[PDB]
Design a binder for these strands. Structure first.
Ligand SMILES: [K+]
Ligand SMILES: [Mg+2]
Ligand SMILES: [Mg+2]
Ligand SMILES: [Mg+2]
Ligand SMILES: [Mg+2]
Ligand SMILES: [Mg+2]
Ligand SMILES: [Mg+2]
Ligand SMILES: [Mg+2]
Ligand SMILES: [Mg+2]
Ligand SMILES: [Mg+2]
Ligand SMILES: [Mg+2]
Ligand SMILES: [Mg+2]
Ligand SMILES: [Mg+2]
Ligand SMILES: [Mg+2]
Ligand SMILES: [Mg+2]
Ligand SMILES: [Mg+2]
Ligand SMILES: [Mg+2]
Ligand SMILES: [Mg+2]
Ligand SMILES: [Mg+2]
Ligand SMILES: [Mg+2]
Ligand SMILES: [Mg+2]
Ligand SMILES: [Mg+2]
Ligand SMILES: [Mg+2]
Ligand SMILES: [Mg+2]
Ligand SMILES: [Mg+2]
Ligand SMILES: [Mg+2]
Ligand SMILES: [Mg+2]
Ligand SMILES: [Mg+2]
Ligand SMILES: [Mg+2]
Ligand SMILES: [Mg+2]
Ligand SMILES: [Mg+2]
Ligand SMILES: [Mg+2]
Ligand SMILES: [Mg+2]
Ligand SMILES: [Mg+2]
Ligand SMILES: [Mg+2]
Ligand SMILES: [Mg+2]
Ligand SMILES: [Mg+2]
Ligand SMILES: [Mg+2]
Ligand SMILES: [Mg+2]
Ligand SMILES: [Mg+2]
Ligand SMILES: [Mg+2]
Lengths: 23, 123, 155
RNA sequence: GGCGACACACGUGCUACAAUGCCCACUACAAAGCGAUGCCACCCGGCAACGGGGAGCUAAUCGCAAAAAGGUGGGCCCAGUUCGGAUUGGGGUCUGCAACCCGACCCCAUGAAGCCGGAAUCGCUAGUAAUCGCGGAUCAGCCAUGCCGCGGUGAAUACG
RNA sequence: AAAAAUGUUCUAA
RNA sequence: GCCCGGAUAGCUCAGGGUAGAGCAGGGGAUUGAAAAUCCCCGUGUCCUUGGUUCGAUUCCGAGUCCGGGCACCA
RNA sequence: CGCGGGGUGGAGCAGCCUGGUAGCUCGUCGGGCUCAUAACCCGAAGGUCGUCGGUUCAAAUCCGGCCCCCGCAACCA
RNA sequence: GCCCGGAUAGCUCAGGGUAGAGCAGGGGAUUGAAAAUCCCCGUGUCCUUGGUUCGAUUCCGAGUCCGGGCACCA
């Protein structure tokens, strides 16, 4: 879910990037 | 009782089964398998007895798990409580530790509500 | 509405069957605006219905719809100050709406995992007189037959 | 230092309880805005936050930029779970004179309540509701899930 | 042709 | 005379580690100011004296001052 | 030390007879409706049963002493 | 001891070819609600055992328990 930061969905929510949502 | 001391559930893929071990999330499950040549899709039921011990050996030797991890987590809380730092008082009285406000929620840390009586109006 | 009637939004016939009754039913499967997903569901269920008991889907769909339209239902009243269950006949527009609504509602009751299967099976049962939406339609008609004593409180 | 307290109580919201869903990879289609100790292309280090290089743009030109839901392919198979992401341990990053009280982010681990909510109660009549994302003001940073805007997909119903 | 009681004192700007 | 039962703040009363309350009054919040309501405050050698106890306003005894009642007789 | 009855959430009453299970109405507290209060509606908490002792595996319940509180009786002379 | 009866869903009661109905309880429709109402839904060795019959609630026997009644008491 959007609250799960360790996912490509939660990173979109916080507007941030990481291993779980790279660019 | 197979690896480490927990029986990881059969019928599931091996990568999700290993997560049922305290100390292994999904990303560590990704490692151990790849570092040992076991198809992450293989069902636990369908692993060699050679693959059991190959998966087991790495898992149990690379990172510390179940009981020891809990003992080292407990040791650090205990350490913070012993020295008397502000985090130590939080873990004592049972209130949150990471800056969260307590006027409203904190229920995960406080537990069920303890409803009290309130101040009254005038008729 | 207070000043004038509400005018009926005439829907756009769908592209597979060219039918207006079909799109209203697609609109009832639709949630949070995802129409395309809600179109696949009806169509995946449709292909199923040509398999399970080979019959032209358009006919199995309308036969369920026709066997869910309730001819009567109870409504509320007021006369004196007492509110009973007054039976009143159902307008054709509302029959359609209750059917499609109960169809999906009946469908999502079922214990099947994929959506279109639940859609296919309820349409299959209802077009043969069984299933959730048919228990509901009959249930509504039976409650209205019960309160026929208060039919004189009809408007 | 406090405005962030916490036996409690209420309002407004965010996130959800899953399969019309979740996850990974591939691949499309916006609008309105902002941008000279500003926005940062691309490049190497790094699992990542970021760091170091380093073009272009005083901006219908260069940049923020990837829009997301969606479309395709594949994985999960009804489990408190590959649902949910609170709480907590450890390790970092960055702005800042300074992150103890009291920052945001990232990574390993931890993975709570929650199985659709009592009495009661709110909004919306159409490109509306619902859902999807995007930008701006404030601003070193930021507790924004708030506000002011922006488009994407797109219903149901009104007898009276 | 009517379920359902009540609203402290002074002040009415 | 003879038993039982009450003495604690200015009032009226609760009740083995010198103690409450309400009320009265003062101050705060509230109000336009009040009333009411909420908070805070000052409030006692707990009637004298003896005993038990490390320790008594609490448990016992007495002294004080009040209170509820017993009494020809055939 | 004449004979009875009684003591259990804050109030008033079950439960005792027949040992194992504490219950009912109001009240109290949190929410809701109302402009507000009451009524009303949804939730919740509070009683180791006067006391000491005995019987029993187990006592509010059974037995004995004490404390307290109402009721009856006290005739012939 | 004797005659008469009953036991049937949780409570009540109807019954050789069925296992029933009402109320209690479940949600749902209803109002502001307490309901009445409306709806659907469940809840049985019909006390146990033999025997009858093609079959068993039934009919029979026999015992279990609880109803009634009668008579008695040395
Ligand atoms: K005489
Ligand atoms: Mg997840
Ligand atoms: Mg694990
Ligand atoms: Mg805080
Ligand atoms: Mg609440
Ligand atoms: Mg919010
Ligand atoms: Mg809320
Ligand atoms: Mg941006
Ligand atoms: Mg869990
Ligand atoms: Mg649970
Ligand atoms: Mg999980
Ligand atoms: Mg930490
Ligand atoms: Mg800080
Ligand atoms: Mg579930
Ligand atoms: Mg809901
Ligand atoms: Mg309007
Ligand atoms: Mg969503
Ligand atoms: Mg900012
Ligand atoms: Mg915070
Ligand atoms: Mg925003
Ligand atoms: Mg009055
Ligand atoms: Mg005056
Ligand atoms: Mg004398
Ligand atoms: Mg006095
Ligand atoms: Mg004043
Ligand atoms: Mg003395
Ligand atoms: Mg004297
Ligand atoms: Mg004297
Ligand atoms: Mg005198
Ligand atoms: Mg008492
Ligand atoms: Mg009492
Ligand atoms: Mg009794
Ligand atoms: Mg008993
Ligand atoms: Mg009780
Ligand atoms: Mg209350
Ligand atoms: Mg007003
Ligand atoms: Mg009220
Ligand atoms: Mg209770
Ligand atoms: Mg006794
Ligand atoms: Mg007992
Ligand atoms: Mg006489």
């Amino acid at each position: 879910g959007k609250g799960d930061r360790r996912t490509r969905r939660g990173k979109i929510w916080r507007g941030t990037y990481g291993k779980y949502r790279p660019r | 009782a197979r690896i480490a001391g927990v029986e990881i559930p059969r019928n599931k893929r091996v990568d999700v089964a290993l997560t049922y071990i305290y100390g292994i999330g999904k990303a560590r499950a990704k490692e151990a398998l790849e570092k040992t040549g076991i198809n992450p899709a293989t069902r636990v039921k369908d692993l060699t007895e050679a693959e059991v011990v190959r998966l087991r050996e790495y898992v149990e030797n690379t990172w510390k798990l179940e009981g020891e991890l809990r003992a080292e987590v407990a040791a650090n809380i205990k350490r913070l409580m012993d020295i008397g730092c502000y985090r130590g008082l939080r873990h004592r009285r049972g209130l949150p530790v990471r800056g969260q406000r307590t006027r409203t929620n904190a229920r995960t840390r406080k537990g069920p509500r303890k409803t009290v009586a309130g101040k009254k109006k005038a008729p | 509405a207070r000043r004038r009637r509400a005018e009926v939004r005439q829907l756009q016939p769908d592209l597979v069957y060219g039918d207006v009754l079909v799109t209203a039913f697609i609109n009832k499967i639709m949630r949070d605006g995802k129409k395309n997903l809600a179109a696949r569901i009806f169509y995946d269920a449709c292909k199923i219905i040509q398999e399970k008991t080979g019959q032209e889907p358009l006919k199995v769909f309308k036969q369920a719809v026709e066997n869910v339209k309730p001819r009567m239902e109870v409504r509320s009243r007021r006369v004196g100050g007492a509110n009973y269950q007054v039976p009143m006949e159902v307008s054709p527009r509302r029959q359609q709406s209750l059917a499609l609504r109960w169809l999906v509602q009946a469908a999502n009751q079922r214990p099947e995992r994929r959506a279109a299967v639940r859609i296919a099976h309820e349409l299959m049962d209802a077009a043969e007189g069984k299933g959730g939406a048919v228990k509901k339609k009959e249930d509504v008609e039976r409650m209205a037959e019960a309160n026929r004593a208060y039919a004189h409180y009809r408007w």
